[PDB]
Write a protein that binds this ligand. Structure first.
Ligand code: CA
Length: 172
């Protein structure tokens, strides 16, 4: 995924007379954890191709309480991944945010480093929750970056995925 300019600073104002969209959301996983003996334990990523979800996009609605809701409407939102447990078992996983709907706190008059998106996704047998923690905003360009954590069920396993994200916001 892309990154922000070294001089990126500020907040991205939200004009409540305008409508907005996420033009691109890119999720790059850094960590896959699988539950074993009741504990989430780390695994080794063995897939050598790209594991990122990218081109995710959709309307960013301004709600009556001032919160924003992102509705995923298109994107590459599904990547097959294989991870390896310490003892050697290989587990095929599905990394996805298909049908994501995620919302911020109320009264979000700008996007700032304390804005969060929290939501749920679900595709066939995979259902999950994700939190996007914004860490840096370029108020000039509408680019944001941060970290994410997702929890899901994939092929009979409880899985936690962490990583970094980039997104681009623009008017409609
Ligand atoms: Ca933050």
């Amino acid at each position: 995924c892309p990154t922000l300019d070294d001089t990126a600073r500020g907040a991205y104002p939200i004009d409540s007379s305008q409508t907005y969209r996420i033009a691109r959301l890119c999720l790059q996983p850094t960590t896959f954890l699988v539950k074993e003996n009741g504990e989430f334990v780390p695994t080794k990523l063995v897939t050598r191709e790209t594991t990122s979800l990218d081109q995710i996009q959709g309307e960013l609605k301004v709600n009556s309480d001032g919160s924003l809701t992102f509705v995923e409407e298109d994107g590459i939102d599904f990547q097959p991944v294989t991870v390896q447990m310490a003892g050697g078992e290989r587990i095929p996983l599905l990394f996805t945010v298909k049908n994501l709907v995620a919302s911020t706190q109320p009264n979000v008059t700008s996007i700032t480093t304390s804005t969060d998106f929290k939501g749920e996704f679900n595709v066939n047998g995979t259902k999950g929750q994700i939190s996007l923690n914004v860490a840096k905003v370029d108020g000039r360009t509408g680019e944001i970056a941060g970290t994410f954590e997702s929890e899901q069920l994939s092929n009979g396993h409880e899985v936690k995925i962490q990583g970094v994200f980039y997104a681009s916001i623009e008017p409609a």
